[PDB]
Amino acid sequence: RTLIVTTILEEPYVMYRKSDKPLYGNDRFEGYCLDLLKELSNILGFLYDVKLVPDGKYGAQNDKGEWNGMVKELIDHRADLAVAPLTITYVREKVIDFSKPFMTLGISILYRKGTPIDSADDLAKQTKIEYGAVRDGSTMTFFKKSKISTYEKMWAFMSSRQQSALVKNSDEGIQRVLTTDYALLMESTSIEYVTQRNCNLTQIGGLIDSKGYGVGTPIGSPYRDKITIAILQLQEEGKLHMMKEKWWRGNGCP
Amino acid sequence: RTLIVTTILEEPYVMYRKSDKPLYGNDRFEGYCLDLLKELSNILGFLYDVKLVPDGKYGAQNDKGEWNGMVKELIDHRADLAVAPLTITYVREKVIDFSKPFMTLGISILYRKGTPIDSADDLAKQTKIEYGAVRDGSTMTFFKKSKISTYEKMWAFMSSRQQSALVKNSDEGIQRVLTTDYALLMESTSIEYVTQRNCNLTQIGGLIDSKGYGVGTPIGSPYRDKITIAILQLQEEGKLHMMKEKWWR
Amino acid sequence: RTLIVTTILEEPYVMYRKSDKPLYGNDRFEGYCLDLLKELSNILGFLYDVKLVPDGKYGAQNDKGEWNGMVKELIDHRADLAVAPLTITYVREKVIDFSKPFMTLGISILYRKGTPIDSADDLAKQTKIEYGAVRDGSTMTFFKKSKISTYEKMWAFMSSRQQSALVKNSDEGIQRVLTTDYALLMESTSIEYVTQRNCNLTQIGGLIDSKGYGVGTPIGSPYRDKITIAILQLQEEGKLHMMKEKWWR
Amino acid sequence: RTLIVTTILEEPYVMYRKSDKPLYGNDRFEGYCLDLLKELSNILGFLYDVKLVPDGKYGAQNDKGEWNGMVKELIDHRADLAVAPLTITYVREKVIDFSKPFMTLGISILYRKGTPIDSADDLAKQTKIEYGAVRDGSTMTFFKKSKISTYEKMWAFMSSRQQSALVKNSDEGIQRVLTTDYALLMESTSIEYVTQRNCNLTQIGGLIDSKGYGVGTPIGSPYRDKITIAILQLQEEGKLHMMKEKWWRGNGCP
Ligand SMILES: C=C(C)[C@H]1CN[C@H](C(=O)O)[C@H]1CC(=O)O
Ligand SMILES: C=C(C)[C@H]1CN[C@H](C(=O)O)[C@H]1CC(=O)O
Ligand SMILES: C=C(C)[C@H]1CN[C@H](C(=O)O)[C@H]1CC(=O)O
Ligand SMILES: C=C(C)[C@H]1CN[C@H](C(=O)O)[C@H]1CC(=O)O
Ligand SMILES: [Cl-]
Ligand SMILES: [Cl-]
Ligand SMILES: [Cl-]
Ligand SMILES: [Cl-]
Ligand SMILES: [Cl-]
Ligand SMILES: [Cl-]
């Protein structure tokens, strides 16, 4: 049968292909996650139908404990796989079955060049430089759920004033960094992609934590273990590394 | 029921506790993996019995394709869990159910300081400096199975002369690096621990791959997903980081 | 049964948690004493409900000898435990059962930096600099009841002019020290916290006595000895020290 | 009735009085603890009979979980109070009812003057300078029971070679410090007493922990709370402070 794959537009993981003609079906998309999906398909022998998540969200839990985004798509069995930069977290792993990571990463800081700023600590000990994260993303959830002091502190600032320091998406975060005195808490993988296209931007400091992106499947899915096995193979063969090189190269920045 | 936990002595993950008197049961052991196991048992509410793997192996296949080591213990249901620096790999994941990694790592190079060697490619291009890995470990298997040109070249070197360039265990590899002109392909986390204790040694280059250590369970185990979830929580709370800091310094 | 825990807002022991949205129940509060209470509940296995003391007092007697504050709450069995910077004193210990101290302290002097004042004796000998304490706190009562010459002199000064030199609470005492020529007799642990946040202020001299904060229970409570034992264990494990470090820095 | 008070000889808490005639009864003894006992007696209105603990020990638990020393005296109801420098610890509080502390203290280091040594950390990071504690005392038990790294380390050294770095009592520890390259882990109160009599000795660093001496009573004793109340009063009246000054003065050392 044919698997329904939920995904979301996010450079360079999943993007609209460029063409002069209207596009249809899976041919609408290209990017790292599409190449990964093709490799998984070839290895496991399934057909797939790529569908953008209707609410345009990744997956977060509200006050009632109700889920949204690609996570909710899986929970309701409206999709068989989620293939996207979907961060493997404690709260999400409790509600879906993630494959093992196809890409590792950590929270870090995107900022303009030329400044004394060197760490998260630097930001937490002042109020002049604004800083935030994408609202309801795993990065925000990390700061909110944290019981570590410095990150407890950054959260209190981030969420203050009705969350005015937060952004709705990465592109908005990037523009805010480029225009104003603002630093975006962003996943290192996305920082690496952006800083190789726009030589005005840089990563500040190292990785604040350690996690990965995983293919999402519903709890009890027969495909999860098979996908994990295929990802392990692709990693061992150097394939995932090439795929990352391919999509992350960009224009080149020093 | 008290869970049977297979493991293996390996610094600083699992070590004999130093005492003036004889030790018994779980009290014989200390280290990163013991601290992990204690945290896991508290979170999930299980009792456990730590048991050294009888053949003292991690887990590989012979030419007949029979497994050994901690991996065989799980396949055969002689253990409920394996808690050790057991590398999550394609071959192993097909026969047991790993939790998600509690520690990430990659293959890198342990060598002495002060050399001009800067990468695996530097080693592959030459024959003066000897290099190898622990026989039947995931690192050796990585080289054996690679179709990458540089790594194929390295594998031909390592398997030459009836695998004289290989060592039986990490301690042997370390002494070999210290004494002779030899570089050990070794997991990055272990190199970190070694170079903090041997100030004449260093890591050469970066990581040539990306993988993890996971808790091993038999295929179908009801503990695997619970342990994954517990591990994700310990990571997010910064406890795993703290545990590594304690044992690595 | 869920235990009723009486307490009082006082930095940094018990504070309202900062949030963008309204808070409810125990989630309203954070601080040293909340961390202590959580550790205690985990060790002893009790659930608890934190309740601010309705009259907002620690616990003293009026001239009729009736008690108020958290102390009265315990005497009257309106609370199971009091967890707060509640000083273990002779008068209080006679009417409630304190656990052993979770924190030690002594009365000392909070004053501005750059003065030549070096001791309580320096204050007692003069009348230019005003000094006082929080009305009805254990510090005031210490001075009221002392037969030590220097402390008697200080008490006559403090009770002069209808106790104009006294303040209703610590925050008031702190602002008074910052603004005017005034020294506050204050518990050393609180001075430590204040001087880390007000870099123009300092402790003057050493501790003039030795006492502790303890968890309060009604006389006869079956929780008192268990809580003492839990506290001794947290102290020995270095956890209380860590808890203080977290909140005081 | 008359209370049986178990105690042990330890300067300057409990000592044989000096006299030219043989001494009997309570008149054999003097020191801080005797003055404290007298004050407690006057306040509560009891008579007392002071008895040295027969096995000459404070109180520690063996392999079977059997107790000895003054602690065991109380457990077996052979004594009503223990009045001595008996350290209030977790393991002991589980088996007797301690009063609240009459004196506070912490573990610290007794050593010869003139050295670079400044902390416990200094000692733990070498093997040349020997260091230990009184065998089976609460200080030893602290290092043994510890899960803190530096003290975990010191314990392993201390207990090595069949505990050759340990001593049987404080006097032996003091002589060992004065004669050899040895540092004694000792309670600060006793360090203060010794360093004011022997100007060749000094405390190294500060307090490693925080505890007190308490009057011991058996679990369920009717006297414990009354004694706590009396101690609180004595402390508030400045009496305990004077008593300490009186017995700790010694010869004077810079
Ligand atoms: C909003 C984006 C782009 C996603 C991607 N991974 C995280 C997630 O899966 O929640 C989010 C990023 C972040 O929270 O920094
Ligand atoms: C022989 C050791 C120490 C083990 C540990 N992890 C790898 C494994 O789980 O196979 C081996 C190391 C290596 O192959 O570099
Ligand atoms: C009014 C406060 C803050 C309390 C705290 N402890 C003492 C008590 O428990 O009475 C008071 C302070 C003092 O009297 O210096
Ligand atoms: C061996 C002595 C003198 C006693 C005194 N207090 C401790 C106790 O009550 O165990 C011991 C000292 C120590 O362990 O440093
Ligand atoms: Cl530009
Ligand atoms: Cl998994
Ligand atoms: Cl081969
Ligand atoms: Cl008590
Ligand atoms: Cl009066
Ligand atoms: Cl001399």
For residue A42, report the phi and psi dihedrals to the nearest 5 degrees.
Answer: -65, -40
Residue D166 CB neighbours (<10 A): 18
Say whether A189 counts as a known binding-site residue. no
Which residues does chain B have within 8 Å of residue D160's beta carbon, measured at their own beta carbons?
20
CB pairs under 8 A between A and B: 66
Q: What secondary structure letter does DSSP report for B128?
A: S
Residue A100 CB neighbours (<10 A): 26
- Interface partners of chain C (CB pairs < 8 Å, 3 or more) are A, D
- Interface partners of chain D (CB pairs < 8 Å, 3 or more) are B, C
Q: How far is C233 from chain D (nearest CA, A)?
A: 5
Whole-angstrom Cα Rg for chain C: 18
Residue type, B124: A
Q: What secondary structure letter does DSSP report for D219?
A: T
Task: Name the strands in the sheet holding C201-204, side by side, starting at the edge strand that comes first in the sequence.
Answer: C130-132, C182-187, C107-112, C201-204
Which residues does chain C have within 8 Å of residue D235's beta carbon, measured at their own beta carbons?
209-211
CA angle D237, D238, D239 (to 5 degrees): 90
Q: What secondary structure letter does DSSP report for D130?
A: E
**Which run of H or E residues covers position C67?**
none
Residue A152 CB neighbours (<10 A): 15
Considering the domain architecture, whether residues C180 and C150 belong to the same structural domain is answered as yes
3-state SS string for D174-214: HHHHHHCCEEEEEEHHHHHHHCCCCCCEEEECCCCCCEEEC
CATH of the domain at D59: 3.40.190.10
What are the angstrom distances between the C-alpha of B192 and each of A37, B17, B196, D106? 35, 22, 6, 37
Which range marks the domain in which residue D89 is found?
Answer: 1-105+211-254
Contact D156 B246 (CB under 8 A): no
- Closest alpha carbon to B243 in A209, D147, B234, B15: B234
Considering the domain architecture, whether residues B154 and B241 belong to the same structural domain is answered as no
Three-state DSSP class for residue A103: strand
Residues A150, A148: Cα–Cα separation, whole Å? 6
Considering the domain architecture, whether residues B220 and B201 belong to the same structural domain is answered as no
Three-state DSSP class for residue B94: coil
- The residues, ordered by sequence, that sit 6+ positions from B27 with a Cβ below 8 Å of its Cβ are B17
Half-sphere exposure of D125 (CA within 13 A, CB side): 6
Residues D141, C127: Cα–Cα separation, whole Å? 52
Residues B48, D144: Cα–Cα separation, whole Å? 24
Maximum pairwise Cα distance, chain A: 56
Contact D211 C235 (CB under 8 A): yes
- Closest alpha carbon to B75 in B101, B94, B103: B94
Nearest CA to ligand 4 atom 3: D170
Chains C and A touch (3+ CB pairs under 8 A): yes
Q: How far is the CA of A86 from the centre of ligand 1 (A)?
A: 7
Residues A53, A38: Cα–Cα separation, whole Å? 19
Residues B231, B226: Cα–Cα separation, whole Å? 9
Substitution candidate for ligand 2 out of B103, B170, B207 with most atoms within 8 A of CB = B170
- Which DSSP string corresponds to A120-150? HHHHHT-SSSEEE-BTTSHHHHHHHH--SHH
Considering the domain architecture, whether residues D204 and D223 belong to the same structural domain is answered as no
Considering the domain architecture, whether residues D21 and D89 belong to the same structural domain is answered as yes
Nearest CA to ligand 3 atom 14: C137
Q: Å resolution of this model? A: 2.0
Chains D and A touch (3+ CB pairs under 8 A): no
Q: Which residue has the tokens 């030199």?
A: C165
Antiparallel, parallel or unpaired: β C201-204 and C107-112? antiparallel
Contact C20 A149 (CB under 8 A): no
Q: How far is the CA of B82 from the centre of ligand 6 (A)?
A: 15
Query: Are C214 and C84 a contacting pair, CB within 8 Å?
Result: no
Residues A240, A231: Cα–Cα separation, whole Å? 8
Say whether B87 counts as a known binding-site residue. yes
Considering the domain architecture, whether residues B97 and B217 belong to the same structural domain is answered as yes
Distance of CA D79 to the CA centre of its chain: 19
Distance of CA A228 to the CA centre of its chain: 19
Tell whether the torsion through CA atoms of B178, B181, B186 and B191 is positive or negative.
positive
Residues D74, D217: Cα–Cα separation, whole Å? 6
Contact D235 C211 (CB under 8 A): yes
Atom in ligand 4 nearest the alpha carbon of residue D10: 3
Residue type, C121: D
Considering the domain architecture, whether residues C41 and C7 belong to the same structural domain is answered as yes
Q: Is the CB of A137 under 6 A from ligand 1?
A: yes
Which residues does chain B have within 8 Å of residue D159's beta carbon, measured at their own beta carbons?
19-20
Three-state DSSP class for residue A10: strand
- Give the ligand with the smallest distance to the CA of C156: 9
- Closest alpha carbon to B134 in B84, B168, B182, B174: B168
Say whether B92 counts as a known binding-site residue. yes
Residue C129, classified by CB atoms within 10 Å of its CB into exposed (0-12), middle (13-18) or buried (19+), is: middle
Substitution candidate for ligand 1 out of A58, A158, A192 with most atoms within 8 A of CB = A58
Tokens found for residue B19: 């005492």
Whole-angstrom Cα Rg for chain A: 18
- Please state whether C11 falls in left (phi above 0), alpha (psi between -120 and 50) or beta: beta
* Number of structural domains in chain D: 2
Q: Which residue has the tokens 């089976």?
A: D136
Contact C19 A149 (CB under 8 A): no
Three-state DSSP class for residue B27: helix
What are the angstrom distances between the C-alpha of C4 and each of B44, B61, B142, C13, C99? 29, 61, 60, 18, 16
Considering the domain architecture, whether residues C173 and C137 belong to the same structural domain is answered as yes
Contact C18 A162 (CB under 8 A): no
User: What are the helix (H) ranges across chain B?
Assistant: 32-44, 69-75, 90-93, 120-124, 138-145, 149-163, 170-179, 188-195, 224-236, 239-248
Considering the domain architecture, whether residues B89 and B116 belong to the same structural domain is answered as no
Half-sphere exposure of B65 (CA within 13 A, CB side): 3
User: What are the helix (H) ranges across A45-187?
Assistant: 69-75, 90-93, 120-124, 138-145, 149-158, 160-163, 170-179
Say whether A92 counts as a known binding-site residue. yes
For residue A179, report the phi and psi dihedrals to the nearest 5 degrees.
Answer: -100, -40
User: Which residue does chain C place closest to A162, by CA atoms?
Assistant: C20
Contact A156 C246 (CB under 8 A): no
User: Which residue does chain C place closest to A149, by CA atoms?
Assistant: C246
Considering the domain architecture, whether residues D78 and D175 belong to the same structural domain is answered as no
Which residues does chain D have within 8 Å of residue B246's beta carbon, measured at their own beta carbons?
149
CA angle B240, B242, B245 (to 5 degrees): 110
Considering the domain architecture, whether residues D94 and D216 belong to the same structural domain is answered as yes
User: Which residue does chain A place closest to C35, by CA atoms?
Assistant: A147
Tokens found for residue B148: 């990458």
Which residues does chain C have within 8 Å of residue D233's beta carbon, measured at their own beta carbons?
90
Considering the domain architecture, whether residues A99 and A216 belong to the same structural domain is answered as yes
Nearest CA to ligand 4 atom 2: D137
